[PDB]
């Protein structure tokens, strides 16, 4: 009544405010649509095209991360067209991705792995040669290995909209698009270690935590930070009576998903 | 389908010949003499006994015995601390601690195997994506002490440097079947 | 066999073989595990967990492994709601400190905001 | 062939000289094992066969397993495997033979 | 068989010994030879087949007197029928692959893991996390050489089973010992322990 | 095989069988220990066309069980006929080669 | 020597398999079924695999099934050997044990 | 190499050795400390740089399915040398 | 037709569903939530007051001759107030069909035994008691079956630690095997393995 | 507040059962210190019986009491019959368990445990 | 005619020299007892169906073997055993009275899986 509108998700109905996206509605009915570029706190960007769904009686697929929801739209999350779109996007993402999982600190907690296992195919028809990119050096905290970037732009949008640096971008075009700086420049702000958290594919990793463990080993203890007086919520990962790292928690009132480099 | 093992017996017909045959069987111990003959035949056969420890029992390349960490022909270690071996080891016998080697490579500091927990299942060498951890052929590695059976990185590396000439050939033989 | 008037609080300690130590001196934690920020998956933020207090872990002199005298060091129970976990804890005689569930707040999002005439939402990174 | 080496399974502990712990040792069975060993007459040796007996093995973290027979009895030789190849158990028997080759008891008595 | 079958001592030890009626067997929960030696027509390889069984011919041996002798004969003849089956399995063995061609359940080959990204991911995950199994519960049983071996497997939507009970042939067979031993001596009790093909790794487990 | 035409006769008579044709020992009648290399085949899901895992996903064709006589919810539950869980098991037939051992 | 009651006291070989399995994955739990009945291993692996496949809704391929049957029957032979020969031993006959263990 | 400590104990390739005051050295009394004398770091350093005329080279190690996953290495930075992540082999752009 | 997926026949589904209707309308006083699975298996859930009548009917009735008790289990689900889900898997040799009957119990809510129906259940009910703590009625000899002779606890309860609370050793002082509190040289390592991405949308739990 | 009773419709009948069990144990102790050749007196055994009984004196639900009595009768059976050896009987006395003190300060000096 | 079979295969199962009479006895007894049941009870209707069907089969075929093949119950002695079992069950069900509303409904989420 208060400008809400009725919409369906595989028949199930839900009333959503105008401007709401397909993704937010599918969430409002408990469904989580795949993602590599939408992060819930960053400007929208329809790059990965992994959020593709079909709308009933609609020919093509829409980007649920950016398409606002219209009245009476039925959203088919688990139909043939959506599945095949996801499989195609996974083929494309993994075409030029390096066989580095067993040396990638992101192993076991990689969104690419889990989304390939849950939404993609189990084979490769790529019979060609992959590419490679010369790694940057942006400081002593963030390790850059850019053969693994899936060009999601999260690092850029975060640096610009949340940290306020505007020193990261995309150099070049086409398949040779090189995310990063154009010159050697240390990206040492006080909200820099969160780019590690929002890079899903291990291109950006913690140099301290490099190689020291794997996510399944760690036991996760919910605690808080003390370096400041904000009271940032954190998770403390331990491995056989030893602190391995500090990883943030979610608290929309304090530290939505961020923490300072001093804290982590 | 089915068959009978002890219902073959049909209605009883008896003659003097049959009675006398059963009587001889019961009085001269026919059926036992046959077991005696079998045991006799076995006395004049060649025994299957091998002369251990000089001549030994056969085996196959796939035999999974003692563990060893291998190397590339350059001498560099194959392990990269990916930890699949300890993630799947269903006995929780493997223990690993990694750290950036001075040259920057991803390598281990700890790699321990409680060979009192290993069930010798082979999952670690089929999980290793670099054919580093293997289950060698050696089975004659008994000890007088429990502690000796708790291998570390140096022990496994020495075993690898001791059996490579055999491990590598058995691999070369078996790696097409996988 | 008709009904009976018990009229008291449940107590199962005496039937569980749990020592006085691990009932009186134990503080259970009831919570919904927080999402791992290395991932954008939200499927482990659904079921309520029950976790016990952490105790000592000392290196073994021989090898250097982690040892414990805590049997419940790795005890984890899964519940569909908060009252179920509270009931289980009360029943088994444990002390608990509950932690409400953290749901993200719904957020307005627009792809046009990135392209604006007068606001600061205007982004320079397409 | 065991007897080829002089080895003979006698069923009474009062006649045996060694016991091979050939499998998993539960808490409900440890008293009987210690009793039998106690009932074996000195000189008495023990051989742990497998990974269950040495350190519990595949059932190490169980509530009903002793993490090693070496907790209940003293062990001379440990034979690893799950299961140990009979060839390996024989290797262990001969290792025990040699250990006995190196007892030097009367020399000690004479040195006392 | 020459040593045993027609030997009057083996017979005097295994004949009219440890007798089981068919109804008592069914009730007590017997399975396999402990069921056939009594004359019950039942075999989970012809009924409820679980593999290329139903493509391979073989006969079920059946006893008349539910004694240790008929069970021994059933076992010998089951060995002979196993030879009959092995002959066919040898002569008609098809070409092809050995593990499901679905790399989200069965890991991919090494040469494909070391060149294909999807296969490497799937290997990594199957060997660290495993494969998620849709919720549900089964009771699958096979004709193990002891009898009906079954597993009741409960699954959440996870990589680990929530409950896995093993139904062992030998639990009920041993439960039936007090009955089958009634009116018998010690040596007969030994023979009865033997005729049940008792193994305790499945009974105690 | 080392036997010498007399022990063989003796043990064949004692056992009543022709053992020399069926020996408990393996004399070069076995596959070698060094075989050539194999070339294993590949399964059907190795194509490059009409191979989408959404078609060959059996792990996701599962469905929760069908519900009858759910009292707490819907689907609660001439005269009908007495039904069976299945038709009676047929009677077996005794073999044609050796039905009476 | 006439028996009036048998009270089997099992449990001297309980290990907690059914609980460790809960603490393992499926592959990571397979060897328990080999270790359960240790004379008819492949059959237990086969039962476990068949159950897991039912839950997964997959079908093993033909060659694999034929191999499963082959080795299942080989295990039947193993187990019947062991049964018959230990039966005999516990009854007195000792040679069949030695004759068939070579096989 | 295998260097010794003031106590005589050898320092492993992990940099580990017991301090002179550490009681844990009794386990090595009347016995030995097992170390691996072939340090892989020195060995892989002793190997030479493999030049190449292509800007992007692959490395499977050696033997194909007997080595490591095939990774591709960029060689634009003429001062540096590209090092495989699995093995330690170095590669350099020959023509720069 | 597809070689990886599993051939599915609806005939068995129909047979078992019809028989489930049969059982439900012939035992309304006890039956709850009959159901059949994608894999062809019949599951009949009941009130525990109906255990003996249901099992006796399924054994003795003519169109239902489930007179072999394959298994008898329990399942701890600490969430629900009645944790233990007791399961009766049965078999008909006359129809070559199986069936599963389920009840529910609690730490302080025992049920009746079925040894009057299936003698195979003596040891299975002893096992349930030893492992989960469920008490049965009119059981001839209800004691422990698998646990040690002085063991405290019910180990298959999810609340019971995998490694237990005590640990055994031999002490020369007393010359006996004694029980001491647990203390491990290597602590069992708990691996969090659940993927955070929904895997089967057919089982999605609506909020 | 309404539930099904196991045996006792009230705490008094459960107490009757508990007393029967106490009598059984009190009468059995001597026979099992004789048979098992335990190296303790008959008074220690009965003190231990009374202590194990008081260990659960705080209960008020008749169902918990009924189940405790069932367990006690199970143990008394295991003991009357010699199914359990002197080991399991002397497990009750904890002759080797170093007794942790209840003094806050000693618990502070040895370890971080409360 | 077809003489009393020398023996069944099942152990402890004696041959019946009056198989057609025992069956009639048992089925008529079952019917006579099923009348004390309420007429709306499904047990009564179903069991009457089964018993009258088998009774007509018996009255239509004196050949014991053709009867076996026509009755799908194995040997004629297994059929008699099952007849007396169904009779005892009829008595026990007259005692239990299962043709009544559900005694108690389950708690909210007792059969929810997963959970
Ligand atoms: C003595 C004659 C009886 C034994 C015998 O071997 O000849 C019988 C001969 C061997 O039968 P076989 O089992 O078929 O031969 C096995 C291989 O040919 C075995 O052939 P092989 O190539 O393996 O080499 C065998 C070689 C073995 O080489 C040796 O010299 C070792 C002999 C063992 C000494 C102990 O020569 C012999 O076997 C001759 C055996 C001489 C008897 C040794 C035992 C007597 C010890 C005296 C007590 C002091 O059989 C007969 O000719 C008829 C039986 C004669 C009745 C006596
Ligand atoms: C027809 C039958 C034929 C078979 C019988 C033929 C047997 C003949 C054997 C002759 C060998 C004689 C030496 C055997 C002594 C073995 C006893 C022994 O081991 O005790 C060690 C003992 C141990 O001495 P000890 O002083 O070191 O003991 C110290 C205390 N304990 C053992 C607890 C640590 O040595 C002797 O004292 C024996 C001395 C040898 C001379 C004895 C006469
Ligand atoms: C005009 C003539 C006047 C003279 C009068 C005499 C006329 C000749 C009469 C000949 C009689 C035959 C000789 C008698 C000896 C045999 C006795 C006998 O038959 O006993 C049989 C007994 C029962 O066998 P069973 O099959 O169980 O039948 C049970 C009954 N329903 O079972 C047994 O007793 C045998 C079982 C024993 C098993 C132990 C192991 C035996 C080992 C066999 C070794 C053989 C070597 C012999 C060496 C001898 C050298 C000294
Ligand atoms: S570096 Fe990481 S966060 Fe930045 S665009 Fe690439 S994948 Fe996204
Ligand atoms: S980002 Fe993910 S898929 Fe890519 S190498 Fe790392 S773990 Fe593997
Ligand atoms: S063989 Fe199996 S049990 Fe042994 S270390 Fe490897 S994975 Fe672990
Ligand atoms: S699987 Fe191989 S590379 Fe990975 S940690 Fe184990 S030994 Fe090292
Ligand atoms: S074979 Fe393995 S599981 Fe079996 S007893 Fe030996 S070590 Fe234990
Ligand atoms: S989530 Fe929509 S394009 Fe990336
Ligand atoms: Zn390389």
Helix (H) or strand (E) holding I58: helix I51-60
Specify the pairing of strand I136-137 against strand I111-112: parallel
Ligand 4 pocket member A205 (CB < 6 A): no
Q: How far is the CA of A188 from the centre of ligand 5 (A)?
A: 25
Residue I12 to chain D, least CA–CA distance (Å): 40
What is the Cα–Cα distance from C36 to I197, expressed in whole angstroms?
12
Contacting partners of chain A (3+ CB pairs under 8 A): B, C, E, F, H, I
The pick from A27, A47, A53 for probing ligand 9's pocket by mutation, whose C-beta has the most ligand atoms within 8 angstroms, reads: A47
Q: Is A101 in the pocket of ligand 5 (CB under 6 A)?
A: yes
- J83, closest residue in chain I (CA to CA): I149
Question: Cis ω on the peptide bond leading into residue B53 (within 30° of 0)?
Answer: yes
Does ligand 4 have an atom closer than 6 angstroms to the CB of A154? yes
Token representation of residue I115: 């040894």
Q: Alpha-carbon distance J98 to J101, whole Å? A: 9
Query: What sign results for the dihedral spanned by CA atoms K89, K90, K91, K93?
Result: positive
3-state secondary structure of A85: helix
Q: Is B75 strand, coil or helix?
A: coil
User: Does J61 contact C8 at a Cβ distance shorter than 8 Å?
Assistant: yes
**In this structure, which long-range contacts are made by residues D84-87, counting pairs with CB atoms below 8 Å and at least 24 apart in sequence?**
D84/B139, D84/D49, D84/D50, D85/B57, D85/B65, D85/B139, D86/B57, D87/B52, D87/B56, D87/B57, D87/B139, D87/B140
Q: Is E68 annotated as a binding residue?
A: yes
Q: Identify the three-state secondary structure at position B88.
A: helix
Kindly give, in sequence order, each residue whose CB lies less than 8 Å from that of residue A208, ignoring residues fewer than 6 positions away: A141, A245
Among candidate residues K61, K52, K62, the one with its CA nearest the CA of residue K83: K52
Question: Does residue K27 contact residue K80 with C-beta atoms inside 8 Å?
Answer: no
Q: Between chains, do B1 and E70 touch, taking CB under 8 Å as contact? A: no
The closest alpha carbon to G54, from C89, E25, E134, belongs to E134
| Whether the bond into H69 is cis, omega within 30 of 0 | no
Element (H, E) at D55: helix D51-55
Would the CB atoms of I144 and G11 count as touching at under 8 Å?
yes
Q: How far apart are the first and last CA of chain D?
A: 41
Rg of chain J on CA atoms, in Å: 18
Cα pseudo-dihedral I11, I13, I16, I21, rounded to 10:
-110
Report the length, in residues, of chain F: 101
The domain of C35 spans: 1-126
Whether the CB-CB separation of E134 and F59 falls below 8 Å is answered with yes
Query: Which residue, chain included where needed, has tokens 């008490």?
Result: I135
Task: State the Cα–Cα distance between residues E72 and E63, nearest whole angstrom.
Answer: 10
Do the bridges between strand E161-167 and strand E147-155 make them parallel or antiparallel, or are there none, so unpaired? antiparallel
- Which H helix or E strand runs over E147? strand E147-155
- Contact criterion met (CB below 8 Å) for A213 and A174: no
Query: Would you call I82 and K73 a contact, using CB atoms and an 8 Å cutoff?
Result: no
Mention every residue, 6+ apart, whose C-beta is less than 8 A from residue I200. Answer: E132, E134, E135, E157, F59, F60, F62
- Counting every residue, how long is chain C? 126
Residues 6 or more apart in contact with residue C44 via CB below 8 angstroms:
C33, C35, C36, I194, I196
Question: Hey, is the C-beta of I5 within 8 angstroms of any chain J C-beta?
Answer: no
Residue in I3, I132, I119, I10 with CA at minimum distance from that of residue I69 = I119
Whole-angstrom CA distances from A157 to A49, A53, E201, F18 are 17, 24, 60, 87
Cα A163 to Cα A159: distance, rounded to the nearest angstrom:
5
By residue range, what is the domain housing residue J58? 1-114
Dihedral sign, CA of I169, I173, I175, I181? negative
Contact D72 I169 (CB under 8 A): yes
What is the token pair recorded at E88?
């066919």
Give me the residue label for tokens 């390349």: B61
Mutation target among E102, E139, E147, E203 for the I interface, most CBs of I within 10 A:
E139
Q: Is the Cβ atom of B79 under 6 angstroms away from ligand 7?
A: yes
> Which of B56, B55, B126 shows the shortest CA–CA distance to B90?
B126
* E148 DSSP β-pair partners: E143
Q: Residue J23 belongs to what H/E stretch?
A: helix J11-35
What's the domain count of chain C? Answer: 1
Query: How far apart, in whole angstroms, are the C-alpha atoms of residue B100 and residue B103?
Result: 8
Which residue of chain D has the CA closest to G24? D58
Task: Report the sign of the C-alpha dihedral through residues F76, F80, F82, F87, in that order.
Answer: negative
**Region for E114 from its dihedrals, namely left if φ exceeds 0, alpha if ψ lies in -120 to 50, beta otherwise:** alpha
**Token pair for residue A90?**
């996974």
Q: Which residues contact A88 (CB under 8 A, 6 or more apart)?
A: none
Residues from chain J that touch C1, judged by Cβ atoms under 8 A, are 4-5
Ligand 4 centroid, distance to A199 Cα (angstroms): 5
Q: Contact partners of D by the rule of 3+ C-beta pairs under 8 A?
A: B, G, I
Residue A5 in 3-state DSSP?
Answer: strand
Pairing of strands C4-5, C27-31: unpaired
Helix or strand (DSSP H, E) at G75: helix G62-91
The answer, yes or no, to whether any atom of ligand 6 lies below 6 A from the CB of B68, is no
- E128 Cα to the center of ligand 5, angstroms: 14
Write the CA distances from E193 to A169, E71, E157, E197, integer angstroms. 78, 13, 42, 7
Sheet strand arrangement including I42-46? F66-68, I31-36, I42-46, I97-102, I87-92, I66-73
Whether the CB-CB separation of F65 and I44 falls below 8 Å is answered with: no
Distance, in Å, from the CA atom of K8 to the CA atom of K27, rounded to the nearest integer, reads 22
HSE-CB for B36 with a 13 A CA cutoff: 5
Where helices occur in chain K by DSSP H, the ranges are 19-34, 42-60, 64-71, 76-96
A74 contacts A56 by C-beta, under 8 angstroms: yes
Q: Is the backbone peptide bond immediately before A137 cis, with ω within 30 degrees of 0? A: no
Closest by CA position to C90, among listed C12, C33, C1, C3: C12
d(CA K73, CA K64): 12
Which atom of ligand 2 is nearest the CA belonging to D109? 27
Contacts of A247 in chain C (CB under 8 A): 36-38
Contact A95, A29 (CB under 8 A): no
**Cβ-Cβ contacts under 8 Å, A120 against chain F:** 53
Q: How large is the angle between the packed helices K76-96 and K64-71, nearest 10 degrees?
A: 50
Expressed in angstroms and rounded, the spacing between residue G36 Cα and the centre of ligand 8 is 10
Which residues of D fall in the annotated binding site for [4Fe-4S] cluster?
A: 52, 82
Cis upstream peptide for K114 (omega within 30°): yes
Binding site membership of B87 for ligand 6 (Cβ less than 6 Å): no
Chain center to CA of G39: 5
The CB density around residue G85, as the number of other CB atoms within 10 Å, is 20
Contact I191, I184 (CB under 8 A): no
Structure tokens, B1: 């389908």
Of all ligands present, the nearest one to the C-alpha of C109 is 9
Q: How far from chain centre, in Å, is Cα A213?
A: 21
Enter the tokens of residue E114.
């070391």
Instruction: Measure the CA–CA gap between E59 and E78, rounded to whole angstroms.
Output: 8
Option in K100, K103, K115 nearest I79 (CB): K115
CB B82 less than 6 A from any atom of ligand 7: yes
Nearest CA to F71 out of B155, I166, I47 is that of: I47
- The rounded distance, in Å, linking the Cα atoms of E44 and E37 is 16
The token duo for I54 is 């249901």
Question: CA I31, CA I47: separation in Å to the nearest integer?
Answer: 7
Locate all alpha helices (DSSP H) within E92-169, ordered by sequence.
Answer: 110-113, 117-128
Do E189 and G6 make contact, defined as CB atoms within 8 angstroms? yes
Residue B111 CA to residue B151 CA, distance in Å, equals 8
CB E25 within 8 A of CB I120: no
Which technique was used to obtain these atomic coordinates?
Answer: cryo-EM
Return the closest-CA partner of residue B86 out of B75, B77, B104, B98.
B98
Number of other residues whose CB lies within 10 A of the CB of residue K38? 11
Q: With contact defined as beta carbons under 8 Å apart, do F15 and G99 qualify?
A: no
Is there a contact between A117 and E119 if contact means CB atoms under 8 Å apart?
no
Give the integer Cα–Cα distance in Å for H5 and H22: 13
Distance between terminal CA atoms of chain F? 34
Interface of D with B (CB under 8 A): 1, 4, 51, 54-58, 60-61, 68, 70, 75-82, 84-88, 90-92, 94-95, 99
Distance (angstroms) between ligand 1 centre and the Cα of J60 equals: 87
Looking at ligand 7, which residue's alpha carbon is closest to its atom 1? B128
Cβ contacts of K34 within 8 Å, gap of 6 or more: K44, K47, K48, K51, K90
Q: Where are the alpha helices (DSSP H) in chain A?
A: 22-28, 80-95, 111-119, 154-158, 194-198
User: Whose atoms come closest to the Cα of C40: which ligand?
Assistant: 9
The domain spans of chain K are 2-115
Distance CA A211, CA B80 (A): 9
Q: Which ranges of chain B would DSSP assign to H, the alpha helix?
A: 16-28, 30-43, 84-88, 123-127, 153-174
Closest chain J C-alpha to I43 CA, distance in angstroms: 27
Considering its fold, how many domains does chain D have in total?
1
Say whether E104 and F59 touch across the interface (CB within 8 A). Answer: yes
Contacts of B93 (CB under 8 A, 6+ apart): B113, B114, B115, B117, B118
Q: Which two tokens stand for residue A13?
A: 């109905």
Max CA separation in chain E (angstroms): 70
Q: I184: which chain D residues are within 8 Å (Cβ-Cβ)?
A: 61, 67
Q: Residue C36 corresponds to which tokens in the numbers above?
A: 């791992």
User: Is E110–B123 a contact, with Cβ atoms under 8 angstroms apart?
Assistant: no
In contact, F61 and F53? CB cutoff 8 Å? no
Phi and psi at J28, nearest 5°, equal: -85, -35
CB contact under 8 A, E118 and A123: yes
Among the partner-chain residues A103, A129, A134, the one whose CB lies closest to the CB of H74 is A134
What are the backbone angles phi and psi of residue I187, rounded to the nearest 5°?
Answer: -80, 140
Beta strands, E only, C35-112: 48-52, 58-59, 66-67, 76-79, 95-98
Minimal CA–CA distance to I78: which of B113, C92, D43, D95?
C92
| Burial class of residue A33 (count of CB atoms within 10 Å of its CB; 0-12, 13-18, 19+) | buried
Q: Are E51 and E57 contacting, i.e. CB atoms less than 8 angstroms apart?
A: no
In a 3-state reduction of DSSP, which class is residue D98?
helix
Q: Give the contacts of A118 (CB within 8 A, at least 6 positions apart).
A: I195, I197, I198, I199
How many whole angstroms from E189 Cα to the centroid of ligand 8?
28
**What's the domain count of chain J?**
1
Domains of chain H, residue spans: 1-96
**Residue B128 CB less than 6 A away from ligand 7:** yes
> H or E element: which one contains E150?
strand E147-155
Residue A104 annotated as lining a ligand binding site: yes
CB neighbour list of residue A77: distance below 8 Å, 6 or more residues apart: A9, A10, A26, A31, A33, A53, I201
When CB atoms are compared, the residue of I16, I31, I34 closest to F85 is I16
Helix (H), strand (E), coil (C) string for A103-169? HCCCCCCCHHHHHHHHHCCCCCCCCCCCCCCCCCCCCCCEEECHHHCCCCCHHHHHHHHHHCCCCCE
Neighbouring CB atoms inside 10 A of D5's CB total: 12
Q: Looking up tokens 């079956």, which residue turns up?
A: I145
């Amino acid at each position: 009544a208060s400008n809400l509108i009725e919409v369906f998700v595989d028949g199930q109905s839900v009333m959503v405010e105008p401007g709401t996206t397909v993704l937010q509605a599918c969430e409002k009915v408990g469904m989580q649509i795949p993602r590599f570029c939408y992060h819930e706190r960053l400007s929208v960007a329809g790059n990965c095209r992994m959020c593709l769904v079909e709308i009933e009686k609609a020919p093509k697929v829409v980007a649920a991360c950016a398409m606002p929801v219209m009245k009476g739209w039925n959203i088919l999350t688990n139909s043939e067209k959506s599945k095949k779109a996801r499989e195609g996007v996974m083929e494309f993402l993994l075409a030029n991705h390096p066989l580095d999982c067993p040396i990638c600190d992101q192993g076991g907690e990689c969104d690419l792995q889990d989304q390939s296992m849950m939404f993609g195919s189990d084979r490769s028809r790529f019979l060609e040669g992959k590419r490679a990119v010369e790694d940057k050096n942006i400081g002593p905290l963030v390790k850059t290995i850019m053969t693994r970037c899936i060009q999601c732009t999260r690092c850029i949008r975060f640096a610009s909209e949340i940290a306020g640096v505007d020193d990261l971008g995309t150099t070049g075009r086409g398949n040779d698009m090189q995310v990063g700086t154009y010159i050697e420049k240390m990206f040492m702000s006080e909200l820099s270690g969160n780019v590690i958290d929002i890079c899903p594919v291990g291109a950006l990793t913690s140099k301290p935590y490099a190689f020291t463990a794997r996510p399944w080993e760690t036991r996760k203890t919910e605690s808080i930070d003390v370096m400041d007086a904000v009271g940032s919520n954190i998770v403390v990962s331990t491995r056989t009576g030893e602190v391995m790292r500090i990883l943030p928690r979610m608290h929309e009132d304090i530290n939505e998903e961020w923490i300072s480099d001093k804290t982590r | 389908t089915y068959k009978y093992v002890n219902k073959k017996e049909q209605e009883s017909e008896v003659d003097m010949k049959s009675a006398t045959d059963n009587a001889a069987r019961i009085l001269m111990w026919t059926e036992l003499i046959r077991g005696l003959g079998m045991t006799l035949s076995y006395l004049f056969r060649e025994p299957a006994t091998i002369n251990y420890p000089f001549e030994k029992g056969p085996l196959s390349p796939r035999f999974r015995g003692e563990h060893a960490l291998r190397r590339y022909p350059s001498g560099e270690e194959r392990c990269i601390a990916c930890k699949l071996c300890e993630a799947i080891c269903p006995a929780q016998a493997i223990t690993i601690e990694a750290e950036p080697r001075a040259d920057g490579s991803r390598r281990t500091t700890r790699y321990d195997i409680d060979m009192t927990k290993c069930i010798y299942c082979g999952f670690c060498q089929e999980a290793c994506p670099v054919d580093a951890i293997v289950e060698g052929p050696n089975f004659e590695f008994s000890t007088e002490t429990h502690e000796e059976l708790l291998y570390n990185k140096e022990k496994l590396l020495n075993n690898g440097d001791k059996w490579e000439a055999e491990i590598a050939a058995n691999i070369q033989a078996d790696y097409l079947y996988r | 066999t008709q009904l009976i008037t018990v009229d008291e609080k449940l107590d199962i300690t005496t039937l569980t073989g749990v020592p006085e130590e691990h009932i009186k001196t134990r503080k259970v934690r009831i919570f919904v595990p927080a999402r791992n920020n290395m991932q954008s998956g939200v499927n482990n933020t659904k079921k309520w967990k029950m976790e016990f207090d952490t105790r000592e872990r000392w290196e073994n002199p021989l090898m250097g492994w982690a040892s414990t005298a805590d049997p419940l060091s790795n005890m984890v129970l899964t519940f569909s709601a908060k009252e179920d976990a509270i009931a289980f804890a009360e029943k088994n005689g444990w002390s608990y400190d509950v932690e409400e569930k953290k749901v993200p707040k719904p957020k307005s999002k627009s792809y046009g905001a990135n392209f604006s005439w007068n606001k600061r939402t205007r982004v320079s990174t397409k | 062939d065991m007897d080829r080496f002089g080895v003979v399974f006698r069923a009474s502990p009062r006649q045996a000289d060694v016991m091979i712990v050939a499998g998993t040792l539960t808490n409900k069975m440890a008293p009987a094992l210690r009793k039998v060993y106690d009932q074996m007459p000195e000189p008495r040796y023990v051989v742990s066969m497998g990974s269950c007996a040495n350190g519990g093995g595949y059932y190490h973290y169980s509530y009903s397993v002793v993490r090693g027979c070496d907790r209940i009895v003293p062990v001379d030789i440990y034979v690893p495997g799950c299961p140990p190849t009979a060839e390996a158990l024989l290797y262990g028997i001969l290792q025990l033979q040699r250990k006995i080759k190196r007892e030097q008891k009367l020399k000690i008595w004479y040195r006392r | 068989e020459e040593m045993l079958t027609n030997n009057r001592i083996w017979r005097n030890r295994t004949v009219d010994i440890g007798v089981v009626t068919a109804e008592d067997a069914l009730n007590y929960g017997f399975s396999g030879v402990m069921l056939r030696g009594s004359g019950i027509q039942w075999d989970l390889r012809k009924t409820q087949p679980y593999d290329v069984y139903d493509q391979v011919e073989f006969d079920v041996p059946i006893g008349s007197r539910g004694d240790c002798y008929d069970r021994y004969l059933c076992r010998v003849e089951e060995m002979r029928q196993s030879l009959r089956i092995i002959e066919q399995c040898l002569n008609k063995m098809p070409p092809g692959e050995i593990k499901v061609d679905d790399a989200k359940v069965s890991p991919p080959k090494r040469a494909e893991m070391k060149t294909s990204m999807e296969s490497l991911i799937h290997h990594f995950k199957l060997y660290t996390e495993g494969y998620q199994v849709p919720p549900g519960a089964t009771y699958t049983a096979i004709e193990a050489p002891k009898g009906e071996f079954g597993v009741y497997l409960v699954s959440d939507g996870s990589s680990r089973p929530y409950r896995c009970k093993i139904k062992a042939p030998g639990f009920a067979h041993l439960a039936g010992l007090d009955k089958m031993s009634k009116g018998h001596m010690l040596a007969d009790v030994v023979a009865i322990i033997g005729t049940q093909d008792i193994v305790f790794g499945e009974i105690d487990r | 095989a080392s036997a010498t035409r007399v022990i063989q006769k003796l043990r064949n008579w004692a056992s009543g069988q022709d053992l020399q044709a069926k020996l408990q020992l393996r004399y070069q009648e076995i596959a070698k220990r060094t075989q050539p290399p194999p070339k294993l085949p590949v399964g059907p899901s190795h194509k490059l066309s009409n191979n989408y895992y959404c078609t060959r996903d059996g792990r996701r064709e599962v469905v929760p069980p069908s519900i009858i006589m759910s009292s707490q919810k819907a689907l609660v539950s001439t005269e009908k006929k007495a039904v069976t869980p299945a038709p009676p098991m047929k009677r077996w037939e005794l073999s044609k080669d050796q039905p009476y051992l | 020597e006439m028996v009036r009651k048998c009270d089997p006291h099992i449990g001297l070989l309980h290990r907690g398999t059914e609980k460790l399995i809960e603490y393992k994955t499926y592959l990571q739990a397979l060897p328990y079924f080999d270790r359960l009945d240790y004379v008819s291993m492949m059959c237990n692996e086969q039962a476990y695999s068949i159950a897991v496949e039912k839950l997964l809704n997959i079908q093993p391929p033909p060659r694999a099934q034929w191999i499963r049957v082959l080795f299942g029957e080989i295990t039947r032979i193993l187990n019947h050997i062991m049964a018959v020969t230990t039966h005999a031993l516990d009854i007195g006959a000792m040679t069949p044990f030695f004759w068939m263990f070579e096989e | 190499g295998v260097q010794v400590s003031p106590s005589g104990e050898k320092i492993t390739h992990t940099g580990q050795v017991y301090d002179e005051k550490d009681y844990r050295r009794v386990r090595f009394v009347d016995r030995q400390k097992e170390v691996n004398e072939n340090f892989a770091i020195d060995l892989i350093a002793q190997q030479p740089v493999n030049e190449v005329e292509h800007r992007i080279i692959a490395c499977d190690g050696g033997g194909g399915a007997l080595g490591h996953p095939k990774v591709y290495i960029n060689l634009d930075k003429e001062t540096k040398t590209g090092t495989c992540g699995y093995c330690g082999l170095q590669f350099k752009q020959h023509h720069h | 037709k597809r070689p990886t997926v599993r051939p599915r026949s609806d005939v068995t589904h129909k047979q078992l569903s019809a028989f489930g209707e049969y059982v439900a309308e012939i035992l309304p006083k006890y039956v709850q939530q009959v159901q059949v699975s994608c894999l062809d298996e019949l599951e009949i859930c009941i009130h525990p007051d109906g255990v003996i009548p249901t099992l006796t009917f399924l054994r003795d009735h003519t169109n239902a001759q489930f007179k072999s008790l394959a298994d008898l289990t329990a399942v701890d689900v600490p969430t629900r107030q009645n944790r233990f889900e007791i399961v009766y898997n049965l078999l008909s040799l006359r129809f070559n069909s199986r069936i599963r009957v389920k009840t529910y119990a609690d730490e302080l809510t025992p049920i009746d035994s079925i040894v009057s129906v299936h003698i195979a259940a003596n040891w299975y009910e002893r096992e349930v008691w030893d492992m989960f703590g469920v008490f049965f009625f009119n059981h001839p000899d209800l004691r422990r079956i698998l646990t040690d002779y002085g063991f405290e606890g019910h180990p298959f309860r999810k609340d019971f630690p995998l490694t237990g609370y005590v640990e055994l050793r031999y002490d020369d002082e007393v010359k006996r095997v004694v029980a001491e509190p647990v203390e491990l040289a290597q602590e069992f390592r708990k691996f969090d393995l659940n993927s955070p991405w929904e895997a089967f949308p057919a089982y999605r739990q609506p909020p | 507040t309404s539930v099904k009773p196991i045996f006792s419709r009230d705490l008094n009948e459960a107490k009757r059962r508990v007393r029967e069990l106490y009598r059984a144990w009190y009468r059995e102790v001597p026979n099992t210190v004789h048979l098992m050749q335990l190296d303790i007196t008959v008074k220690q055994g009965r003190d231990k019986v009374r202590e194990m009984f008081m260990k659960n004196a705080h209960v008020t639900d008749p169902r918990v009491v009924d189940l405790l009595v069932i367990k006690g009768k199970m143990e008394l059976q295991e003991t009357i019959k010699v199914w359990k050896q002197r080991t399991h009987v002397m497990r009750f006395f904890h002759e080797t368990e170093t007794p942790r003190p209840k003094d806050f300060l000693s618990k502070f000096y040895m370890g971080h445990d409360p | 005619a077809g003489l009393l079979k020398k023996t069944t295969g099942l152990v402890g199962l004696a041959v019946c020299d009056t198989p057609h009479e025992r069956l009639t006895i048992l089925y008529t007894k079952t019917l006579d007892i099923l009348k004390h049941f309420p007429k709306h009870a499904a047990y009564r209707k179903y069991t009457e169906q089964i018993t009258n069907e088998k009774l007509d089969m018996v009255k239509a075929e004196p050949d014991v073997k053709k009867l076996e093949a026509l009755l799908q119950g194995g040997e004629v002695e297994e059929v008699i055993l099952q007849a007396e079992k169904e009779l005892s069950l009829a008595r026990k069900m007259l005692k239990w009275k299962p043709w009544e509303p559900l005694v108690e409904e389950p708690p909210a989420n007792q059969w929810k899986w997963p959970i």
